[PDB]
Amino acid sequence: YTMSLGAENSVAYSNNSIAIPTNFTISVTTEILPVSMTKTSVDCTMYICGDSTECSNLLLQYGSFCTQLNRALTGIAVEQDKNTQEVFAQVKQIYKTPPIKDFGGFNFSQILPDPSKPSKRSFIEDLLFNKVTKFNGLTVLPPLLTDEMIAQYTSALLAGTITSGWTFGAGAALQIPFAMQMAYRFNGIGVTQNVLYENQKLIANQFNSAIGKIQDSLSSTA
Amino acid sequence: TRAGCLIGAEHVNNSYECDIPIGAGICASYQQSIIAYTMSLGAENSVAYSNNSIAIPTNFTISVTTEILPVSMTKTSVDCTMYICG
Amino acid sequence: LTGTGVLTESNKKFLPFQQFGRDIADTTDAVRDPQTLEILDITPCSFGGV
Amino acid sequence: QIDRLITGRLQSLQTYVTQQLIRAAEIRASANLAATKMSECVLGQSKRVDFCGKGYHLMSFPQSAPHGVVFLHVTYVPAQEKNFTTAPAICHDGKAHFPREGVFVSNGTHWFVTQRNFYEPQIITTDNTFVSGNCDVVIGIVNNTVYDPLQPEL
Amino acid sequence: SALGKLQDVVNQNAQALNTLVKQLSSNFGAISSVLNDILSRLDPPEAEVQIDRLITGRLQSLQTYVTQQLIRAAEIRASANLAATKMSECVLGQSKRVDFCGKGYHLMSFPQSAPHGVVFLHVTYVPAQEKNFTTAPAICHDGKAHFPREGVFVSNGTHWFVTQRNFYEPQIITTDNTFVSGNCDVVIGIVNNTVYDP
Ligand SMILES: *[C@@H]1O[C@H](CO)[C@@H](O[C@@H]2O[C@H](CO)[C@@H](O)[C@H](O)[C@H]2NC(C)=O)[C@H](O)[C@H]1NC(C)=O
Ligand SMILES: *[C@@H]1O[C@H](CO)[C@@H](O[C@@H]2O[C@H](CO)[C@@H](O)[C@H](O)[C@H]2NC(C)=O)[C@H](O)[C@H]1NC(C)=O
Ligand SMILES: *[C@@H]1O[C@H](CO)[C@@H](O[C@@H]2O[C@H](CO)[C@@H](O)[C@H](O)[C@H]2NC(C)=O)[C@H](O)[C@H]1NC(C)=O
Ligand SMILES: *[C@@H]1O[C@H](CO)[C@@H](O[C@@H]2O[C@H](CO)[C@@H](O)[C@H](O)[C@H]2NC(C)=O)[C@H](O)[C@H]1NC(C)=O
Ligand SMILES: *[C@@H]1O[C@H](CO)[C@@H](O[C@@H]2O[C@H](CO)[C@@H](O)[C@H](O)[C@H]2NC(C)=O)[C@H](O)[C@H]1NC(C)=O
Ligand SMILES: *[C@@H]1O[C@H](CO)[C@@H](O[C@@H]2O[C@H](CO)[C@@H](O)[C@H](O)[C@H]2NC(C)=O)[C@H](O)[C@H]1NC(C)=O
Ligand SMILES: *[C@@H]1O[C@H](CO)[C@@H](O[C@@H]2O[C@H](CO)[C@@H](O)[C@H](O)[C@H]2NC(C)=O)[C@H](O)[C@H]1NC(C)=O
Ligand SMILES: *[C@@H]1O[C@H](CO)[C@@H](O[C@@H]2O[C@H](CO)[C@@H](O)[C@H](O)[C@H]2NC(C)=O)[C@H](O)[C@H]1NC(C)=O
Ligand SMILES: *[C@@H]1O[C@H](CO)[C@@H](O[C@@H]2O[C@H](CO)[C@@H](O)[C@H](O)[C@H]2NC(C)=O)[C@H](O)[C@H]1NC(C)=O
Ligand SMILES: *[C@@H]1O[C@H](CO)[C@@H](O)[C@H](O)[C@H]1NC(C)=O
Ligand SMILES: *[C@@H]1O[C@H](CO)[C@@H](O)[C@H](O)[C@H]1NC(C)=O
Ligand SMILES: *[C@@H]1O[C@H](CO)[C@@H](O)[C@H](O)[C@H]1NC(C)=O
Ligand SMILES: *[C@@H]1O[C@H](CO)[C@@H](O)[C@H](O)[C@H]1NC(C)=O
Ligand SMILES: *[C@@H]1O[C@H](CO)[C@@H](O)[C@H](O)[C@H]1NC(C)=O
C-alpha cells in the first residue's frame, strides 16, 4: 500500500477563537544515547604474521603502517574513556539522598539505588543492563570507569537534582524542598506555581504512574 | 588488577583522584614509591534536605574561565606525482 | 593438526567419529588425542601489551 | 606467497581501523550530545523544544546503561483543552487595556484573563492589564468593563 | 599544558606528515626505496616491476594520509561549528543553556584569537556564601493562600520574608509581591502569617 503520513486534522482556526488546556498529563519518556564503544587493540605484527619470524622479517619493508594502525586504535580507546568522563563526571562531590525520602508524594524508588546491590544500581538500571547483551593479537581494554563508578556518578547526579534542583549544576548544592523545586519548574514553562500546589497529589500520582510504565515497557519490549 | 599484572607499585586501601589511569577503576600515583589504588569519584556530600528547609546565597563570586576550541588545521597540499614518482 | 597453546583436560563430549572441535570464527579450540582417546582443550598462550 | 598474505591481511586491518575511526567519530558525536543533555536537561531546565523529551521540559533523570546513558525526561504535556472566544485587547474608557501576562478569553457572556497554558479565568482588573493608547487602532477590540480594585474601597 | 588541545592538532598534523615522508624510504618489497637506483641497476622490464611495487606502496601511504586527513578535518569542522555556535550564543548574546558558556550562570563571554583556534573567556555569576532558612510553599492570611510573585518565602527563627531565589534580600510580605489563589485547605505546607497591605 501507499503509506499514510498520519490523520488529517483541520484545526478549527478562527480570528477570535482560542483553545486553552484545562488539565495536564505529566509525561515521562526515555532517551537512549550511546556514549562509548569497546576499547579494542590489535598487535598488527601478530595479526598479520603471528609467531613467524619469516613474516616478521618481512612487513618491515612496508614501513610504519603497523605503528600507524595501533596509534589510531589507541586514540580511539583513549577517547572512549574521555566520552564517559564528559557525560557522567559532570558533578563535583558525590551527593547522597537523605534517609528520610519525603519528596512531596514523588516516588523515586525505581531510579534511586538499592543496597540489595546488583551493583549499587537502581531498579531501572538493573533492567537496562540485562536487556542489552582474545585471539590473533586482538585484545579488549577495560574502561577506566567501572559500571559501579558510572552508577555512582549517575546516583550523585540524581541525588543532586532531587535535593537541590539546578543549583548544584551552577555552584554549591542549595537544598530546596521538592514540590517547591517543581513549583519553580512550572514557572519556567509559563505555569504560575499554584497549579502545582493545588494539584500536588495529582502531580505525583501522574509522575509515579509514568515512572511505573517505564519499568513495564523496559521489561516487556525487547 | 583487572587491567593486568602490575609490578613495581604498592596497592593501598586509600582512594585518591586519578593521576595515572591504569583501568577498571584502578589508578596510579607517586607518593618515595609508586602506589596503585581505586580512584575516588569525589567527596561524599549528603545535602541537608528537608521538606521545609532552603539554602539561599548571600553573596557571589563572578568567575572567569577559559574554553579553548580548535577552529582550523594546517592547509596542506600533496602533488601525488611528485610524492610517488619524484 | 599443528598449533601452539595450552592443553587442558576438557569436558567436551565429542561424538566418536569426530577428531577435534572448532569454535565460532573457526579457531581450533579442542582436540582428541589419537592414542588414549580423550578430548583436550586448547587455549592460546598468554600474551598481551606491556 | 607471504607478501600476498601480508598485503591482504594489512588491507583487512586498514579497513578495520578506518571503519573504527568513522564509527568512533559517530559515537563521539553521540557522547557530545549526551553530555549536552546532561548539562541542559539534568543540571537545568531547558527551553529548547524537543531537546529534552516531548512537551514542556520540567526535569530529567539520568540512568546508567552498559555503553550509554538513558535520560528519563519529565515533561509537562498539556491538554484537556476547551474552546473560547478571544480578543486581542479590551476597550474600557478608550484605553485598550492589554493583558500583562495571560490572554483574554470569553464565555458566551463574560470575559476573563487566563494564563495561556492553564485555564484559570480571573476577572478583568487594572492589576492584570496595562493600558496603551485608544480603541481606534487595535483590530480586535472588544468592549468590556475593567475592574478597578481601589475604587470599591473608596 | 593549558593550550594542549590546540597543540594536539598541530602534533596530530606534523606526525602524520612525518609518517608520509618516512614512507618514502620503504622498499615495500622492492630492491630499494631510491628509484634512481632501481633504474640504474636494472633492465626496464624488471625495473618496471620494482617501480610498480614502489608505486603501490607509496600510493597506499598517500591514500591512508588523505583518509586520516579527511577524518581529522571532519573532527575539526565539528569543533569549528561548536566554536561558531559559542561565538553566536555566548559572545553575541547571553545563554540560558547550562554549562554551554562556562560553569555557573553565564553573564558574558569574550573572544580571544588563539594561534590556530579560539579561546572564550566566560564570565559567569557563580553564587554562594549560602545560609539556611525555613521555607513555606504559601502563606495563609485571611484564609487566602498567598504565593510569592517572583521570589521565595523564607524564614528567620521568628519572621518571614520574600527573597529573590539567587540572592538573599529579605523584604517583608506584602500584597505587592504576592498573589492570592484559593483557600488555605489545599496547599500542603502552607504556614500562617500576616501579609502587609500597602
Ligand atoms: C485531570 O486529569 C486527571 C487524570 O490525569 C483527572 O484525575 C482523574 O479523575 C478521575 C475522575 O475524575 C479518577 O477516576 C482518576 O483516578 C483520576 N486520576 C488521577 C491520576 O488522579 C482529573 O480529574 C482531571 N482534572 C480535570 C479538572 O479535568
Ligand atoms: C514507591 O514505590 C515502590 C514500588 O513502586 C514502593 O515499594 C513497595 O513498598 C511496599 C510497602 O511500602 C512493599 O510492600 C512493596 O514490596 C514495595 N515494592 C513494590 C514493587 O511494591 C514504595 O513503598 C513507594 N514509596 C512510597 C513512599 O509509597
Ligand atoms: C594402543 O595400544 C596400547 C597397547 O595396548 C594401548 O595401551 C593400553 O591399552 C589397554 C587396552 O585398551 C589399556 O588397558 C591400558 O591401560 C593401555 N595402557 C596405557 C599405558 O595407556 C593404547 O590404549 C592403544 N591406543 C589406542 C587404542 O588408541
Ligand atoms: C461564563 O462565566 C460566567 C462567570 O463565571 C458565568 O456566569 C455565572 O454563572 C454561574 C452559574 O452557576 C452563576 O452562579 C453566576 O452567578 C454567574 N455570574 C454572573 C452572572 O456574573 C457564565 O454562566 C459562564 N458562561 C457559560 C458557562 O456559558
Ligand atoms: C473575523 O472574521 C469574521 C468572519 O468573516 C468577520 O466577520 C465579518 O465582518 C464583516 C464586517 O465586520 C461583515 O461584513 C461580515 O458579514 C462578517 N462575516 C461573518 C461570517 O460574520 C470579522 O469582521 C473578523 N474580525 C473580527 C471579528 O474582529
Ligand atoms: C462598543 O460598543 C459601542 C456601542 O455599544 C460601539 O462603539 C461605539 O462606536 C461609535 C461610533 O464610532 C462611537 O460614537 C461610540 O462612542 C462607541 N461607544 C463605545 C466605544 O463605547 C461598538 O459597537 C463597540 N466596540 C467594538 C465592538 O469594538
Ligand atoms: C530575623 O530577622 C528579623 C527581622 O530582621 C529579626 O527581628 C528583629 O528583631 C529585633 C530585635 O528586637 C527587632 O528590633 C526588629 O524590629 C525585628 N525586625 C522585625 C520585627 O522586622 C529576627 O530577630 C531575626 N531572627 C533571627 C536572626 O534569628
Ligand atoms: C515535613 O516533615 C516533618 C518531619 O517528617 C513532618 O512532621 C511530622 O508531622 C506529623 C503530622 O504533622 C507528625 O505526626 C510527626 O510526628 C512529625 N514528625 C516530626 C519528625 O516532627 C511534617 O508534617 C512535614 N510537613 C510539613 C512540615 O508541612
Ligand atoms: C494556623 O493557626 C491556627 C491556630 O492558631 C490553625 O488553623 C486553624 O485550624 C482550625 C481547624 O481546622 C480552624 O478552625 C481555624 O480557623 C484555623 N485558624 C486559622 C487558619 O487561623 C493552624 O495551627 C495553623 N494553620 C496551618 C499551620 O496551616
Ligand atoms: C588495609 O591495608 C592493610 C595493610 O595494607 C590490610 O591488611 C587490610 O586488609 C586493608 N583493608 C582494611 C579494610 O583494613
Ligand atoms: C471550539 O473552537 C472552534 C470554534 O470555531 C470549534 O469549531 C472547535 O470544534 C472547538 N475546538 C475545540 C478545541 O474544542
Ligand atoms: C466552540 O465551538 C463550538 C462548535 O463550533 C461552538 O458551538 C461553541 O460556540 C464554541 N465556543 C466558543 C466560545 O468558541
Ligand atoms: C542549614 O540546614 C542544615 C540543617 O541540618 C545544616 O546542616 C546545613 O549546613 C545548612 N545548610 C546550608 C547549605 O548552609
Ligand atoms: C540551619 O542549620 C543549623 C545547623 O544544623 C541548625 O542549627 C539551624 O536550626 C538551621 N536553621 C534553619 C532555619 O534551618
Contacts of A184 in chain E (CB under 8 A): 165
| Surface-to-core class of residue D75, CB atoms within 10 Å of its CB (0-12 exposed, 13-18 middle, 19+ buried) | buried
Contacts of E24 in chain B (CB under 8 A): 83
Instruction: From residue D154, give the alpha-carbon distance in Å to each of A42, D148, E95.
Output: 89, 11, 48
- Dmax (CA) of chain B: 80
Q: Are E163 and B56 in contact (CB under 8 A)?
A: yes
**Nearest-neighbour CA in chain B from A213: distance (Å):** 27
Q: Which of A142, A153, B26 is nearest to D64 (CA)?
A: A153
Q: Give, for E179, the enclosing helix (H) or strand (E).
A: strand E178-180
Q: List strands edge to edge, sheet with E146-148.
A: E178-180, E146-148, E139-140, E191-192
Question: Whats the size of chain C, residue-wise?
Answer: 50
A205 lines ligand 1 (CB under 6 A): yes
CB contact under 8 A, E98 and D39: yes
CA of A198 relative to ligand 9 center, distance in Å? 18
Distance CA D105, CA C7 (A): 85
Residue C21 dihedral angles phi and psi, to the nearest 5°: -125, 135
Instruction: From residue A129, give the alpha-carbon distance in Å to each of A35, A148, D28, D60.
Output: 15, 12, 22, 20
Spell out a b/e string for E131-149, using b for 16 or more CB atoms within 10 Å of the CB, else e.
Answer: eebebbbbbbbeebbbbbe
Residue with cell 589419537: C34
User: Within 13 A of E73's CA, how many CA atoms are on the CB side?
Assistant: 9
Ramachandran region of residue E139, left (φ > 0), alpha (ψ -120 to 50) or beta? beta
Q: What is the 3-state secondary structure (H, E, C) of B18-83?
A: CCEEEECCEEEEECCCEEEEECCCCCEEECCCCCCEEEEECCECCEEEEEEEECCCCCCCCCHHHH
The β-bridge relationship of strands A94-96 and B10-11 is: unpaired
- What residue's CA is closest to ligand 2, atom 3? A109
CB contact under 8 A, B45 and A173: yes
- Residues facing B20 on adjacent strands: B28
Spell out a b/e string for A123-148, using b for 16 or more CB atoms within 10 Å of the CB, else e.
Answer: bbbbbbbeeeeeeebeeebbbbbbbe
Distance CA A148, CA E157 (A): 42
Beta strands in D12-110 (DSSP E): 56-65, 68-76, 82-86, 89-91, 98-99, 103-106
- What residue's CA is closest to ligand 7, atom 27? E156
Partner E contacted by D46 (CB < 8 A): yes
- What residue's CA is closest to ligand 6, atom 25? D143
A17 lines ligand 12 (CB under 6 A): yes
Instruction: From residue E28, give the alpha-carbon distance in Å to each of A60, A91, E47, E59.
Output: 8, 52, 14, 11
Q: List strands edge to edge, sheet with D103-106.
A: A17-20, D82-86, D103-106, D111-114
CB contact under 8 A, B68 and E79: no
Residue D12 dihedral angles phi and psi, to the nearest 5°: -65, -35
Distance CA A188, CA A92 (A): 25
Distance CA E190, CA A191 (A): 20
CB contact under 8 A, A197 and E137: yes
Sign of the Cα torsion B46, B52, B57, B58 reads negative
CB contact under 8 A, D44 and E71: no
Distance CA A32, CA B47 (A): 29
Distance CA A182, CA A202 (A): 13
Type of residue at E3? L
Mutate to test the pocket of ligand 4, among D83, D107, D119 (most ligand atoms within 8 A of CB): D107
Residue A211 dihedral angles phi and psi, to the nearest 5°: -70, -35
Residue E117 dihedral angles phi and psi, to the nearest 5°: -170, -155
Distance CA E175, CA B64 (A): 39
Q: At what angle do helices A147-164 and A65-88 cross, to 10 degrees?
A: 30
Q: Are D72 and A214 in contact (CB under 8 A)?
A: yes
Within 8 A by CB and 6+ apart from A100, the residues are none
- What residue's CA is closest to ligand 13, atom 7? B48
Q: Give, for E192, the enclosing helix (H) or strand (E).
A: strand E191-192
Question: Whats the size of chain A, residue-wise?
Answer: 222
Contacts of A69 in chain D (CB under 8 A): 13-14, 17
In the numeric block, which cell numbers belong to residue D27? 559515537
Which of C4, C27, C49 is the closest to A139 by Cβ? C49
Q: Are D121 and D84 in contact (CB under 8 A)?
A: no
Q: Which of D49, B50, A22 is nearest to E189 (CA)?
A: B50
CB contact under 8 A, D46 and E97: yes
Q: How many CB atoms within 10 Å of residue D132?
A: 12
CA of E157 relative to ligand 14 center, distance in Å? 9
- Residues facing E196 on adjacent strands: E174
Give the method of determination. cryo-EM
Q: Which of D134, D142, D81, D80 is nearest to D106 (CA)?
A: D142
Contacts of A94 in chain B (CB under 8 A): 41-45
Distance CA A191, CA A185 (A): 9
What end-to-end distance do the CA atoms of chain A give, in Å? 28
DSSP string, chain A: -PPP----------TTEEEE-S-B--EEEEEEEE----EEEE-HHHHHTTT-HHHHHTTSTT-SHHHHHHHHHHHHHHHHHHHHHHHH---SSEEE--SS--STT---TTTSB-TT-SSS-BHHHHHHHHH----TTEEEEPPSS-HHHHHHHHHHHHHHHHHHTTHHHHSS-----TTTHHHHHHHHTT--STTTGGGTTHHHHHHHHHHHHHHHHHHH--
| Residues flanking ligand 11, CB < 6 Å | A 12, 14, 17, 19; D 81, 83
| Surface-to-core class of residue A13, CB atoms within 10 Å of its CB (0-12 exposed, 13-18 middle, 19+ buried) | exposed
Partner C contacted by A41 (CB < 8 A): yes
A109 lines ligand 2 (CB under 6 A): yes
In the numeric block, which cell numbers belong to residue A128? 537496562
Report H helices in chain E: 4-22, 35-40, 44-86
CB contact under 8 A, B72 and E116: yes
Mutate to test the pocket of ligand 12, among D81, D83, D104, D106 (most ligand atoms within 8 A of CB): D83
Ligand in nearest proximity to the CA of D114: 4
Which of D14, D29, D40 is the closest to E97 by Cβ? D40
Q: What is the count of residue pairs from A and C with beta carbons less than 8 Å apart?
A: 13
Q: Are B21 and A144 in contact (CB under 8 A)?
A: yes
Q: List strands edge to edge, sheet with B53-57.
A: B53-57, E130-135, E152-155, E160-163
In the numeric block, which cell numbers belong to residue E112? 580571544
Q: Are A43 and D81 in contact (CB under 8 A)?
A: no
Q: Which of C21, D38, E73, E86 is nearest to A154 (CA)?
A: D38
Query: Chains C vs E: touching, with 3+ CB pairs under 8 Å?
Result: no
Distance CA A33, CA D60 (A): 14
Instruction: From residue A184, give the alpha-carbon distance in Å to each of A71, D45, E149.
Output: 50, 10, 11
Q: Which of D8, B84, D17, D12 is nearest to E59 (CA)?
A: B84
Q: Among E61, E149, E150, E155, which would you mutate to test the A interface (most chain A Cβ atoms within 10 Å of its Cβ)?
A: E61
CA of D31 relative to ligand 1 center, distance in Å? 40
Mutate to test the pocket of ligand 7, among E155, E156, E173 (most ligand atoms within 8 A of CB): E156
CA of E175 relative to ligand 7 center, distance in Å? 21
Which of A94, A96, A172 is the closest to B41 by Cβ? A94
Partner B contacted by A145 (CB < 8 A): yes
Q: Using CA coordinates, name the residue in chain D closest to A57.
A: D2
Q: Are A97 and A162 in contact (CB under 8 A)?
A: yes
**Nearest-neighbour CA in chain A from B22: distance (Å):** 7
Partner B contacted by A94 (CB < 8 A): yes
CA of D141 relative to ligand 6 center, distance in Å? 10
Type of residue at D139? I
Q: Are E195 and E175 in contact (CB under 8 A)?
A: yes
CB contact under 8 A, A17 and D77: no
Distance CA B39, CA D110 (A): 67
Q: How many CB atoms within 10 Å of residue D119?
A: 19
CB contact under 8 A, A104 and B51: yes
